Symmetry: C3
Subunit: 315 residues, 3 copies
Amino acid sequence: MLSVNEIAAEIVEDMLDYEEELRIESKKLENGAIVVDCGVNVPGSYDAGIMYTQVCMGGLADVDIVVDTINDVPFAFVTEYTDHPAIACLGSQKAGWQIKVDKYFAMGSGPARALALKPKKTYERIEYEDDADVAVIALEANQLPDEKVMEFIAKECDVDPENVYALVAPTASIVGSVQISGRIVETAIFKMNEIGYDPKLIVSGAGRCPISPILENDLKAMGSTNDSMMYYGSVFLTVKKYDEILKNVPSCTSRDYGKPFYEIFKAANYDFYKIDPNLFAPAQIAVNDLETGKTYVHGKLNAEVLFQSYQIVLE
Amino acid sequence: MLSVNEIAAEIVEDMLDYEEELRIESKKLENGAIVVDCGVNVPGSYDAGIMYTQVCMGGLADVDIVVDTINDVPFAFVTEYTDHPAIACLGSQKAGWQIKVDKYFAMGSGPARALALKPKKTYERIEYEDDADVAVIALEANQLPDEKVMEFIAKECDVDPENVYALVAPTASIVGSVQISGRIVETAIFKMNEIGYDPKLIVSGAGRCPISPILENDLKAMGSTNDSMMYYGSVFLTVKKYDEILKNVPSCTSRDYGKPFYEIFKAANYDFYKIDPNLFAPAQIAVNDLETGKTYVHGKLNAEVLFQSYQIVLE
Amino acid sequence: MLSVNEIAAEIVEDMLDYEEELRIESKKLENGAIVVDCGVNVPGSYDAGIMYTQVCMGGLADVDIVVDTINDVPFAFVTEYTDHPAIACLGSQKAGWQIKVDKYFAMGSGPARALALKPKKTYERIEYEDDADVAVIALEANQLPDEKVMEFIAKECDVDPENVYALVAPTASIVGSVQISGRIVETAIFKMNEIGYDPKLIVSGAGRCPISPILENDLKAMGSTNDSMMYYGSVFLTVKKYDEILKNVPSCTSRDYGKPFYEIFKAANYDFYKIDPNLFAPAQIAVNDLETGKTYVHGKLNAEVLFQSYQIVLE
Ligand SMILES: C[C@@H]1Nc2[nH]c(N)nc(=O)c2N[C@H]1[C@@H](C)Nc1ccc(C[C@H](O)[C@@H](O)[C@H](O)CO[C@H]2O[C@H](COP(=O)(O)O[C@H](CCC(=O)O)C(=O)O)[C@@H](O)[C@H]2O)cc1
Ligand SMILES: C[C@@H]1Nc2[nH]c(N)nc(=O)c2N[C@H]1[C@@H](C)Nc1ccc(C[C@H](O)[C@@H](O)[C@H](O)CO[C@H]2O[C@H](COP(=O)(O)O[C@H](CCC(=O)O)C(=O)O)[C@@H](O)[C@H]2O)cc1
């Protein structure tokens, strides 16, 4: 068996060996839980962003950054791949655990989900559950979780708080930008599942996505980070059997294509968990079908919308 | 001295530490030989493909995967380089050992060739031989080798069977697609040697090549994997002295240019070793001549033919 | 505290474990100093170039090579990023120490500058000084430093010579080409400081730059390696507060821009003091302003001048 929590805990302990270089900071709370600030009160870094993404994907993906251009404008890009897409993406990376503890709110991602079974239906669908005595969660939030929050997470994962780790970064941070663009393969897998395609049929995925510039606050960053995938994210996927419904994966087949993600988020009263899950999707995909040996291409890139979302100023 | 077998053996041992993550499976045979299934009865993975390629190149190259686009369609690409091109490519990676043991047929690549001297002329031409007590071979086949096959390989390499490792994957597999596009620098070195240019004059090489989708069977896969290099493989090479003959390196100088490699394989009765070796060539090269300081560019990319070979379906 | 000398010394010790693979050769002098030849009397390699660049950047950057195309012509590129740009680029990588010992001259880069404080004004500007018992210098030179040179460097750094390391390569070598293109982020940081922008405002940078072919002598190579950045180097930067003066970062805003650098240099009778210092600058930048959340784009790519500089011969 592969344990996404045990594998990710090893990555976190490596992060902790390089705190200063990565521009992150950890603290152990009164109950023993370790909270790793990756961008709330510290800058974080590109490498912290890569490692945060690797942790979100349960250690079952390769994630790197390459610098390239869009209409000659330079950007950093995530390039990533996985041969465990259901587990890495739906069983771990998906932000499927809404954290609310009194006034503390966070979007919860990562391996801890596979112990707490959040949401239960995902684990039924992908036929995975972790078995571990350590839990690693990734929280997207503008505040660090305290003892009571970590005690709750530990309890839900059936682990002692002394064996829980949380990575934390806000949407508007370099770790935020990198880890969200690092969901490019996940966007495809998630949309495929939403339209009814069995994620257990997905063999592998590889993706590329520009990393958003950091906008002025977390609400605006929610828009630009998501627009990276929705308007400029590319995925090559391999599946056991093709289904014609897969033409509906790309974002250009959605009723809301052309709207900046910020507008979608605003219409959901700035509540991520109130957004229709059907609205998450990659810009373009190529699907290699093992059964027929064909590769079906769907979608398109849209630099014009991306540059608007990125608040680009040309001369 | 650089020992391609000792260096590659370390990579194989690393693979053995991550079998479930890599989606590979090893077995120790009754005679002690280690057979690592990288795609016959297991899926393998992109990372197993990278490591298989590294092994084929004797541990003397860098191999990685980056996701990028061709006419906006996403593909995974190999990006690779080496500063030991004659040894890594001709002395090791080249599939120069046709394995026939009774009914068992396989294409043999990798460091073990530098112990068995297969073919002998190659080692005379590159002035290299390994001296090791371990042998590592990479077999392209749709069946795993048994004790008798491994015993034969051991005997030919003058090592004990307990000191032989085999990596094995069929042409139609992700390891197959990665490792074959991972031959992009080798294709150039191989063609240069075929046209009479001394490979000892080659200082280094760097290459890029898309990774083929997996087609519906090994016969079709032989075509699409090879067409990756012939129609869309690019190599930057450095040489000590230029020769005008190098204008004939690219595939577009062949009379058979434009033919799908599948048709070439079919014409060879689906026997790789019956293919005219003059057909192996990269699409495009740049050759930096150290003597004059000039860089000569030859060849062209051909996305149109590539997409036909890849069985792309556009909307 | 991050010690650029201690971090870089670890990278050099790694190089020393792989000399034959990297095609480098070290010598331990009578006084214990270690001189690592990376391209004077040895070929060096792409990987030795990467490691030389990492050392120049004090171990505080990520540096890799990817193969890609310019107008379809294949080149190797450096892709790199850092979240310590002031220290890594100005405090370490910049070739800011002229080493003159009798008739020996070399331009010195790398971590040892942060012990010797060369030039002092830089360390005052970036508010960094290293405190280490080891010193690591990188010399761009066509001659290896002897005992007297190394003794001098050691004394300037207040370290014993048994704890000094020098990496050395000439301009016309693969390590020269890689390490110079590996200055792409640095040339932005340096130009920014030279036009009055406080480098303490710079959060991070990410850059891409083609690696020059090796030209026929060091003088030609000085031109083509510089032109890689000036005519084809791209940088994505993040800053705390953008200033409009950053429009003057790109090389195309210099009065001397337009011809390959070798032409500019020969016209100036080989005198650096007669060339606009503002020419030494990246081709194009995108600057993410954390104040406004906008990203400002300046400059342009110039493949036509690059291909002249690179002595490209098309059919
Ligand atoms: C790229 C996105 N954007 C983004 N932006 C920022 N700033 N930060 C982030 O972390 C992300 N993450 C990304 C998204 C994709 N992550 C995410 C978003 C919202 C959620 C919301 C919910 O709370 C969540 O728990 C899920 O949507 C629930 O998921 C379910 O969807 C399915 C529900 O329907 P169903 O299963 O009943 O339908 C049939 C049922 C029939 C049967 O099989 O029995 C089926 O699927 O088979 C089910 O399979 C299960 O997997 C979850 C994850
Ligand atoms: C990119 C290429 N394509 C590619 N594709 C795939 N899917 N996997 C791979 O590993 C590679 N490697 C790459 C290449 C460049 N690597 C490679 C390619 C070709 C070779 C050898 C080639 O086959 C070539 O050099 C031939 O040996 C020359 O051909 C003659 O040499 C051979 C020697 O004669 P024989 O002893 O083989 O004669 C008989 C006669 C035939 C008969 O039996 O009917 C025999 O073998 O049985 C004979 O086969 C004859 O045809 C070696 C390595």
